[PDB]
Design an enzyme around this catalytic site. Structure first.
Site, PDB file in Angstrom:
ATOM      1  CG  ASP A   1       0.032 -20.875 -27.912  1.00 34.99           C
ATOM      2  OD1 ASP A   1       0.390 -21.474 -26.656  1.00 34.99           O
ATOM      3  OD2 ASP A   1      -1.226 -20.659 -28.080  1.00 34.99           O
TER       4      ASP A   1
ATOM      5  CE  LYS B   1       6.911 -23.319 -19.880  1.00 32.15           C
ATOM      6  NZ  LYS B   1       6.632 -22.657 -21.495  1.00 32.15           N
TER       7      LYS B   1
ATOM      8  CB  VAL C   1       4.858 -22.657 -15.490  1.00 26.80           C
ATOM      9  CG1 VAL C   1       5.536 -21.324 -15.159  1.00 26.80           C
ATOM     10  CG2 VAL C   1       5.044 -23.072 -16.991  1.00 26.80           C
TER      11      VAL C   1
ATOM     12  CG  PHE D   1       5.301 -29.725 -23.825  1.00 25.09           C
ATOM     13  CD1 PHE D   1       6.650 -29.522 -23.003  1.00 25.09           C
ATOM     14  CD2 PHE D   1       5.107 -28.536 -24.688  1.00 25.09           C
ATOM     15  CE1 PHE D   1       7.590 -28.548 -23.324  1.00 25.09           C
ATOM     16  CE2 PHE D   1       6.203 -27.511 -24.943  1.00 25.09           C
ATOM     17  CZ  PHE D   1       7.262 -27.525 -24.376  1.00 25.09           C
ATOM     18  N   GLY D   2       4.582 -29.112 -19.971  1.00 25.93           N
ATOM     19  CA  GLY D   2       5.426 -28.772 -18.887  1.00 25.93           C
ATOM     20  C   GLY D   2       4.784 -28.167 -17.691  1.00 25.93           C
TER      21      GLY D   2
ATOM     22  N   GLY E   1      -0.770 -26.639 -17.912  1.00 24.76           N
ATOM     23  CA  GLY E   1       0.023 -27.909 -17.742  1.00 24.76           C
ATOM     24  C   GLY E   1      -0.078 -28.950 -18.809  1.00 24.76           C
TER      25      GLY E   1
ATOM     26  CG  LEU F   1       2.822 -19.814 -12.108  1.00 21.90           C
ATOM     27  CD1 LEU F   1       3.998 -18.908 -12.594  1.00 21.90           C
ATOM     28  CD2 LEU F   1       1.996 -19.256 -10.865  1.00 21.90           C
ATOM     29  N   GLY F   2       0.344 -22.877 -14.994  1.00 21.82           N
ATOM     30  CA  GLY F   2      -0.080 -22.960 -16.344  1.00 21.82           C
ATOM     31  C   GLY F   2      -1.100 -23.771 -16.532  1.00 21.82           C
TER      32      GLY F   2
END
Ligand SMILES: Nc1ncnc2c1ncn2[C@@H]1O[C@H](COP(=O)(O)OP(=O)(O)O)[C@@H](O)[C@H]1O
Ligand SMILES: Nc1ncnc2c1ncn2[C@@H]1O[C@H](COP(=O)(O)OP(=O)(O)O)[C@@H](O)[C@H]1O
Ligand SMILES: [Mg+2]
Ligand SMILES: [Mg+2]
Ligand SMILES: [Mg+2]
Lengths: 350, 346
Positions: free
Chosen positions: B168, B50, B36, B33-34, B31, B28-29
């Site tokens: 953020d 995540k 999701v 550092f992680g 992407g 979903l992200g």
């Protein structure tokens, strides 16, 4: 009085017009500072397209550097990496929507689609599908390791010769190019540095990162160590000889070799376990064999064991703890591991 | 003699077991550092999961900090952010495959799925679908801006009060939570700092750090300026007052307000154009209106013009060049822009 304004300026490659590019929805990977998509160019050419991530600081600068390095590699090391087809810059009003199959506002890079499978994906399916994709007659761990490493080390040597350190060597960034006989090509120059003033260094600086922690030596996440005189035209050559940033790629290539050579090391967990034991015994391959290999009963080191342990020795050369002791990719090429066996192919030879 | 083995220690949340979680394919992200994923918890609870990227330097440590900040926010500022459901840590042998619906090796964080749409996605579809998702009765730019900013500033004030700077803030990190009246909730504490010693500061240090170039002030990419002392339990309060790290969020909130209020500013290029002109006129909203706004013939600033330019004034306060001049999110919340209408004649 009022300010006059003026035209927008957009970067373009001759013969590449945005109207001729259809982008396919669905990113090809998480991505670093950019996102990669499949596309079709002029209706029948399979391409891959990359733009910057809007949410990443200086992503446009990183994409520009990737662009510059790609032009450099295209001019000086053809065949080492995915074929670079240029850039396309789109403005706001002319920018489209990915869901509509059109390129969005901003800078895009384009390459030929070199194949649908990476060495990472292939090796994890098995040595057989990997060998088939590589057109590798000897469909064994030893066979694929010999062929892949000869190609990888050769390409890295050519890149290093023109001052480029890839900095992201790993099975995921290798494609067996079905349209060029299955030969391996590198992808992803987004972390690469141009380390010589040819005419200016690029993405070359002291300090850690970026680095894939699986494929970079844990206390060596840099090309240049911090503190050292920042790279300039003056000191570039000296830094190259002194700090040996190309040896970053040597270590990564050793990791590629381990995974090609040993099925059990093809998982993140497998390679991680090995590198931990390797470190524990002082980055000494023979000590690993002597002290640890016995704990690896689920794995098979035959490809490294073969021919007087030639593969083990090449791994040691590529993976020395110290850069001053670690083989260059060029030097690694002449290693016994790559020798033809005595009378090899005798039974069919003319 | 051979060194002995031993157990692996895994982090777990009471009530949350590996067999309870099914992961759905499709990240979903963006992407960084992680990664999701959507998931299903205990058969019928929609969640988001995540994990740290295996190919990014220090990803696990970044996720560990995001975890710590999530616990702090869960304890101290409930409702400001997506509901935090804890963590689950898995081993290698004990990890599965995403495409088979199972959690892979490593640390995972879990939250309630607060909704299918971010404010970025909604606003770009239009003011109407945004207002609908927000359950915002006044479905105009002014209406959605008032409701959204009251919610965002209120939440940021609560985060700041417990020492958290989000770092953020942007439409992509806001979800209209349909299940909770459409109220906006923040997501993504991956860049957040804990700026008070509770018991220690987290992700808080001098100099530049993580920032979205669209929403962070270009010459101000730090919480503590590069010359600042390292934060300690003894000086944290002083540094908070001196350097006003919360004002990082104030600027970002101003950017959110601009995009909610002005349709033409909702694209990246639109807001980028505005901010360039804004900087060029010395971060002066009145100078923008007088010298630059005439160049924006394709846009409509009515929401900011309304009620004596209340919206413009609130933007000016949230977006002062100097932190020492820039409004806190708490102070901004009391601005005339949020005043009730007088004499409504019901
Ligand atoms: N020239 C190319 N031909 C075919 N596939 C490519 C090419 N360049 C990139 N790809 C594919 O695009 C994907 C991009 O993923 P990437 O941006 O590297 O993110 P990650 O590192 O998270 O996988 C990779 O899987 C790669 O195989
Ligand atoms: N609690 C949540 N509920 C619903 N969707 C979420 C939630 N958390 C994240 N998402 C979705 O997943 C995406 C990525 O999550 P986020 O934490 O923002 O990571 P990143 O921005 O680093 O990719 C978000 O943009 C949003 O679409
Ligand atoms: Mg990559
Ligand atoms: Mg952009
Ligand atoms: Mg986010």
């Amino acid at each position: 009085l009022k300010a006059r304004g003026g035209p927008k300026t957009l970067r373009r490659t001759p013969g590449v017009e945005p109207k001729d590019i259809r982008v396919l929805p669905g990113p090809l990977g998480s991505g670093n500072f950019g996102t990669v998509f499949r596309g079709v160019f002029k209706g029948d050419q399979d391409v891959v397209l990359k733009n910057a991530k809007a949410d990443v600081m200086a992503a446009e600068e990183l994409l520009e550097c990737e662009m510059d390095v790609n032009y450099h590699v295209h001019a000086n090391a053809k065949g080492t990496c995915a074929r670079f087809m240029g850039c396309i810059e789109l403005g706001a009003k002319d920018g489209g929507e990915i869901y509509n199959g059109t390129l969005t506002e901003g800078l895009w890079l384009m390459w030929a689609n070199e194949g649908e499978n990476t060495v990472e994906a292939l090796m994890r399916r098995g040595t057989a599908p990997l060998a088939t994709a590589m057109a590798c007659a000897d469909a064994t761990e030893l066979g694929v390791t010999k062929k892949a490493m000869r190609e990888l080390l050769g390409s890295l040597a050519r890149l290093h010769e023109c001052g480029v350190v890839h900095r992201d060597v790993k099975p995921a960034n290798l494609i067996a190019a079905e349209k060029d006989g299955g030969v391996l090509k590198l992808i992803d120059l987004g972390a690469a540095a141009l380390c010589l003033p040819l005419p200016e260094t690029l993405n070359y600086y002291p300090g850690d990162g970026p680095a894939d922690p699986r494929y970079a030596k844990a206390d060596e996440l840099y090309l240049l160590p911090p503190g050292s005189p920042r790279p300039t035209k003056d000191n570039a050559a000296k830094l190259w000889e002194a700090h040996k940033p190309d040896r970053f790629d040597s270590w990564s290539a050793g990791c590629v070799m381990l995974q090609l050579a040993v099925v059990g090391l093809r998982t993140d967990a497998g390679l991680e376990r090995f590198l931990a034991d390797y470190k524990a015994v002082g980055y000494d391959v023979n000590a690993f064999r002597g002290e640890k290999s016995g704990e690896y009963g689920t794995m098979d080191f035959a490809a490294l064991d073969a021919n007087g342990g030639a593969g083990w020795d090449l791994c040691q050369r590529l993976m020395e703890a110290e850069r001053d002791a670690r083989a260059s990719c060029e030097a690694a090429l002449s290693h016994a591991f790559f020798d033809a066996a005595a009378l090899e192919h005798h039974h069919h030879h003319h």
